RNA sequence: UCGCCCAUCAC
RNA sequence: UCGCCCAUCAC
């Protein structure tokens, strides 16, 4: 049971956050894996950050929620690290991913950010 | 000029020095080795090493009045407080290759300077542990003919008793070096040795008690038998 | 009821008859230190199951905490050290260890003694208190010798004490240059000034109200300042050791590598929160700041390893792999800091099994 | 300003001896955790400093290193007698080197003390 | 993992390590002290210190293949172009307490830093004066077995020759680090090296000549003997 | 624009 | 994170 999933989500938005990576892949600027995600949050470059639900140990991703909140960045969760890596253009997995310029996804990242902001209540 | 002779005890020797004076010694278990930074000499085919009464403390009791010397070649012995082998190197010389020595020490860097020496002196086994926690070596030793103790701790009379439950055979012997200022440094030492006198006589038959002055300070030794 | 030796684990009845025996199949010094300290191993866990399956119940053991783990496993267990199982086992070594029994006891006894090379000690609180008053004293000798250095250099540049309040900077200047007339902006930039401060000193370059310290007077003032660097290094030896004498309640970050490295990792981060937020691809180079500086200014050769260098997997592995080890070693340290900040469970021996798995690969690949 | 530089070197000579006395008081108290019999036995402060600098751990004590440090056969008839019977606690190899480094930086300060005396002599 | 080994030259050592390639080393004349922040190994009764070849050409020349090396245990030597003496620290180790080392420098302030280091390294004497003018230190030097030159001023052939008139014994050795670009920048280095060879071979015999490539460029080492 | 000796700080 | 140059001004 991961502890970093600090809000429960409806049957919506999560597949739309995976879609927001798939349409940014060849159109925008992305950082993939948790250490480049941490660089992209620390340097304030991220416009959305995404973490997988199947990361074990959790103490590799466990720092991301307070580190991105203390920097005013939108965050969301998705079901698995292999699918998240494959959407982020790589053949392995990624425990987390950040979108730095969403390319084609700019208006969908604004839908995700504004609708997540209404369930963080 | 030096010469070498036998003592009254098995495996114990005497050396003659360049004035003519007599001093106690043993036959070296591994010729060419130095074992505690000591005086060592060669004789008829063999090598012989000094027993210093200040450094290998049991030697002071041998000079001052010890009669009850229970060890022989080919026997089994437990040694508590083996340190860097200062005293126990002389029981390793006496007990031989058919005999067995288990050596317990708590202080890791002190036992570390014995580990290379027992890479040759393979009749000693080096065991890291507090002798006040004897369960933490229950699987590493046999029963024994004799126990010796040189850890000199505040409750050391109980250490001898509970190791004699776990390891000593029926009618087997115990020996113990007692440092008064470990148990108490405010009272008269003969009162500290009177508390050891009443605890050893609560589980053993007692057969020797001594003083190590002038070779040591505030220091005694006892010998006992298990029922 | 049960007792053990260097070859295996044995169960006996109250007349001394054997019931069952099992043998070790891993490097036995580990399996022994667990069983000696009352911790249960898999061959004992199967043996006590086989005894309950064969219908036996009078479970007396030698060590108190083994009886404690047995009643936590549900079994109604008691303790006595001189019991018949330990008596049978320790009396007849040839039944349980074979003909060469003392050589097998020797072979594993020296290995068990080599893993028992201890940390934690019963007097380290007294050492923390002396290290704390020694930091208080050494920080005080530095303030006295820097006050003497200020009053003495005020015979050559009296405005300089009224301009530079920081104590290490006032010594670093005298270690590096010391001569007032050899100053320029570039040697004030590295000295850690700010732009609004660098025009001062220079505004007074010829026209300071101080006298003339000789090329032979600045020599005794320099030999005095050079000793204050060795005392700043003593202050830093103590400021590393104050945590090294507290850490005998061992964190995961300590136990994965060693105490002076854990103390310096937190010292360079500024806190465990900061270290638990840093990535592997920063912890790799943490503390290498005089290498980061020269690289940032040039785009030349990048920094290879930080504070993690002074650990055997890097300072005794080939230079071809002193970068390749550093990234993943910083990753398992980045996890250890997050475990110590968020989780609080102790897993250091599994983080060591996992770090040795990547190091094993780096010894087969190359 | 040669005489004013000599005055600051004279104030430095009393301030250096005064901080040597301070760090020697800590060195006596801290090393007494590991060899408490030494404190009454070595009264001369630089001889206590150089002893701890070169010995570090108490089992590096030998007749040879004490006679190189220039102690008398009398003083060497003690120290060794006390090493075999000490009532002190246990500092590890990792701990006792910190007390050795404290003694080494005090021997740096005693060398600076001579550089101040030799500067004034020029 | 590390191992300390002897080199093919008396007093010179080698280390092999965790990459396993050879690095050049010396047995420390004064154990415990540092000079430049060197790499070090403490050993069985000993201490060994490394010379990094990128810090002085004479280290790089010994790595490249220089075979006729004359500086050996207990010899007497005079060296010019020492500055603060990193070179001199390693020949101090190689020569030991049995020998004698003079070091002459012309740059006045950089020699100052060696002055306290020779209070431990008391087989070195540091001397301030023009290497081209032997007469300027004539009272504080003696006859030697070896001369070495690495000031490598435009005058350096006269530096070596006139010091080898005054101080080099019959049968004694010379070494010079020929800085081609500071003797003549107007011609190919092999023409500079050919005049240095043809002037030196009208007083010495030449025994070996080395270009420092492929480690460094356009500098050479020559080694010679006086009859 | 380049050469060597040399300290110190660092990878 | 670090460096240079033109014009003008001063000892």
UniProtKB/Swiss-Prot annotation, chain A:
Q: Which PROSITE patterns match?
A: RIBOSOMAL_L7AE
Cell compartments where the protein resides: Cytoplasm
Q: Does this UniProt record's set of keywords contain tRNA processing? A: yes
Principal place of residence: cytoplasm
**Annotated GO MF terms:** ribonuclease P activity; rRNA binding; structural constituent of ribosome
InterPro entries named among the record's database cross-references: eL8/uL1-like, Ribosomal_eL30-like_sf, Ribosomal_eL8-like_CS, Ribosomal_eL8/eL30/eS12/Gad45, Ribosomal_eL8/Nhp2, Ribosomal_eL8_arc
Going by the UniProt record, its keywords in alphabetical order are:
Cytoplasm, Ribonucleoprotein, Ribosomal protein, RNA-binding, rRNA processing, rRNA-binding, tRNA processing
**Which GO CC terms are listed, alphabetically?**
cytoplasm; ribonucleoprotein complex; ribosome
Lipid biosynthesis among the record's keywords? no
Q: What are its GO biological-process terms?
A: rRNA processing; translation; tRNA 5'-leader removal
Q: Which family does it belong to?
A: Belongs to the eukaryotic ribosomal protein eL8 family.
PANTHER family per record = RIBOSOMAL PROTEIN L7AE FAMILY MEMBER (PTHR23105)
Give the record's subunit note.
May be present in up to 3 copies per 70S ribosome. Part of the 50S ribosomal subunit, where it binds 23S rRNA at its canonical site near the L1 stalk, as well as a possible second 50S binding site near helix 25 and a possible third site on the beak of the 30S subunit. Component of box C/D small ribonucleoprotein (sRNP) particles that contain rpl7ae, FlpA and nop5, plus a guide RNA. These sRNP particles form homodimers, giving rise to an asymmetric holoenzyme. Probably part of the RNase P complex.
Q: What biological function has been recorded for the protein in this entry?
A: Multifunctional RNA-binding protein that recognizes the K-turn motif in ribosomal RNA, the RNA component of RNase P, box H/ACA, box C/D and box C'/D' sRNAs. Component of the 70S ribosome. Component of a box C/D small ribonucleoprotein (sRNP) particle that is involved in pre-rRNA and tRNA processing. Utilizes the methyl donor S-adenosyl-L-methionine to catalyze the site-specific 2'-hydroxyl methylation of ribose moieties in rRNA and tRNA. Site specificity is provided by a guide RNA that base pairs with the substrate.
Q: What is this protein called?
A: Large ribosomal subunit protein eL8
Which species is this record about?
A: Pyrococcus furiosus (strain ATCC 43587 / DSM 3638 / JCM 8422 / Vc1)
Swiss-Prot record, chains B, E:
List the Pfam families hit by this protein, alphabetically.
Answer: Fibrillarin
Q: Which domain of life is it from?
A: Archaea
What organism, scientifically named, is this protein from?
Pyrococcus furiosus (strain ATCC 43587 / DSM 3638 / JCM 8422 / Vc1)
Matching entries from CDD domains are given as: AdoMet_MTases
Kindly give the SUPFAM superfamilies that the UniProt entry links to this protein. S-adenosyl-L-methionine-dependent methyltransferases
Keyword Zinc-finger found? no
Biological process GO terms, please?
box C/D sno(s)RNA 3'-end processing; tRNA processing
PROSITE patterns recorded = FIBRILLARIN
Identify a single GO molecular function assigned to this protein: RNA binding
> Is RNA-binding one of the keywords?
yes
Which HAMAP family does the record cross-reference, listed alphabetically? Answer: RNA_methyltransf_FlpA
Looking up InterPro entries in the UniProt record yields: Fibrillarin (IPR000692), Fibrillarin_CS (IPR020813), SAM-dependent_MTases_sf (IPR029063)
Q: Which family does it belong to?
A: Belongs to the methyltransferase superfamily. Fibrillarin family.
Q: Which NCBIfam families match?
A: PRK04266.1-2, PRK04266.1-3
Name the UniProt key words of this record, in alphabetical order.
Methyltransferase, RNA-binding, rRNA processing, Transferase, tRNA processing
Can you state the subunit structure given in the record? Interacts with nop5. Component of box C/D small ribonucleoprotein (sRNP) particles that contain rpl7ae, FlpA and nop5, plus a guide RNA. These sRNP particles form homodimers, giving rise to an asymmetric holoenzyme.
For this protein, the Enzyme Commission number is 2.1.1.-
Question: What protein name does the entry list?
Answer: Fibrillarin-like rRNA/tRNA 2'-O-methyltransferase
- In which residues is S-adenosyl-L-methionine bound? 86-87, 105-106, 130-131, 150-153
Job of this protein = Involved in pre-rRNA and tRNA processing. Utilizes the methyl donor S-adenosyl-L-methionine to catalyze the site-specific 2'-hydroxyl methylation of ribose moieties in rRNA and tRNA. Site specificity is provided by a guide RNA that base pairs with the substrate. Methylation occurs at a characteristic distance from the sequence involved in base pairing with the guide RNA.
Spans traversing the lipid bilayer: none
């Amino acid at each position: 049971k991961p502890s970093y999933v600090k809000f429960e989500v409806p049957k919506e938005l999560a597949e739309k956050a995976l879609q927001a990576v798939e349409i940014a892949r060849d159109t925008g600027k992305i950082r993939k894996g948790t250490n480049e995600t941490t660089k992209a949050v620390e340097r304030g470059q991220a416009k959305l950050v995404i973490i997988a639900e199947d990361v074990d140990p959790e103490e590799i991703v466990a720092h991301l929620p307070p580190l991105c909140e203390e920097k005013e960045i939108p965050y969301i969760y998705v079901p698995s690290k292999k699918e998240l890596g494959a959407a982020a253009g790589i053949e392995v997995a990624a425990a987390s991913v950040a979108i730095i310029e969403p390319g084609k996804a700019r208006d969908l990242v604004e839908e995700i950010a504004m609708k997540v902001k209404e369930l963080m209540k | 000029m030096v010469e070498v002779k036998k003592h009254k005890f098995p495996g114990v020797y005497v050396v003659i020095d360049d004035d003519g004076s007599e001093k106690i010694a043993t036959k070296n278990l591994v010729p060419g080795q130095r074992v505690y930074g000591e005086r060592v000499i060669k004789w008829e085919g063999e090598e012989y090493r000094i027993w210093n009464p200040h450094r290998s403390k049991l030697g002071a009791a041998i000079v001052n009045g010890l009669k009850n010397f229970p060890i022989k070649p080919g026997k089994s012995v437990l040694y508590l407080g083996i340190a860097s082998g200062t005293t126990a190197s002389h029981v390793s010389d006496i007990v031989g290759w058919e005999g067995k020595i288990y050596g317990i020490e708590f202080s890791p860097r002190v036992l570390r300077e014995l580990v290379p020496i027992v890479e040759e002196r393979r009749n000693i086994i080096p065991i890291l542990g507090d002798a006040t926690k004897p369960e933490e070596y229950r699987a590493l030793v046999t029963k024994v003919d004799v126990i010796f103790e040189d850890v000199a701790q505040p409750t050391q009379a109980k250490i001898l008793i509970d190791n004699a439950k776990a390891y000593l055979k029926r009618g087997g012997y115990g020996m113990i070096a007692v440092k008064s200022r470990s148990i108490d440094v405010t009272k008269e030492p003969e009162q500290v040795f009177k508390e050891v006198e009443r605890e050893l006589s609560e589980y053993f038959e007692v057969i020797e008690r001594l003083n190590l002055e002038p070779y040591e300070k505030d220091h005694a030794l006892f010998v006992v038998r298990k029922p | 009821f049960i007792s053990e030796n260097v070859r295996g684990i044995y169960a006996f009845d109250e007349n001394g008859n054997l019931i069952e025996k099992r043998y070790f199949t891993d490097k036995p010094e580990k399996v022994l230190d667990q069983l000696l300290k009352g911790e249960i191993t898999k061959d004992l866990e199967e043996l006590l199951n086989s005894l309950k399956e064969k219908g036996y119940d009078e479970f007396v053991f030698e060590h108190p905490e083994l009886s404690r783990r047995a009643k936590e496993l549900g079994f109604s267990a008691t303790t006595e050290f001189p019991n018949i199982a330990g008596e049978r086992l320790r009396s007849n070594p040839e039944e349980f260890l074979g003909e060469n029994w003392f050589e097998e006891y020797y072979k594993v006894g020296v290995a068990l003694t080599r893993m028992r090379i201890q940390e934690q000690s019963g007097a380290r609180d007294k050492m923390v208190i002396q290290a704390i008053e020694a930091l208080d004293d050494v920080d005080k000798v530095i303030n006295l010798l820097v006050a003497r250095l200020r009053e003495w250099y005020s015979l050559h540049f009296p405005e300089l004490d009224e301009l530079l309040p920081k104590h290490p900077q006032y010594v670093a200047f005298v270690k590096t240059v010391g001569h007032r007339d050899n100053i320029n902006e570039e040697v004030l930039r590295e000295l850690g000034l700010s732009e609004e401060k660098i025009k001062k000193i220079l505004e007074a370059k010829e026209k300071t109200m101080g006298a003339w310290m000789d090329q032979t007077d600045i020599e005794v003032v320099r030999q005095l300042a050079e000793e204050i660097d060795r005392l700043y290094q003593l202050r830093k030896k103590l400021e590393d050791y104050i945590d090294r004498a507290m850490d005998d309640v061992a964190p995961n970050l300590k136990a994965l590598v060693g105490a002076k490295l854990a103390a310096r990792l937190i010292s360079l981060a500024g806190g465990l929160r900061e270290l638990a937020m840093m990535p592997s691809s920063t912890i790799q180079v943490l503390g290498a700041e005089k290498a980061l500086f020269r690289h940032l200014r040039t785009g030349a050769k990048p920094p290879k390893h930080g504070v993690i260098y002074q650990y055997p997997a890097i300072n005794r592995s080939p230079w071809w792999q002193r970068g390749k080890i550093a990234r993943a070693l910083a990753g398992k340290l980045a996890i250890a800091a997050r475990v110590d900040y968020f989780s609080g469970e102790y897993i250091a021996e599994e983080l060591k099994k996992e770090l040795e798995a990547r190091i094993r690969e780096i010894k087969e690949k190359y």
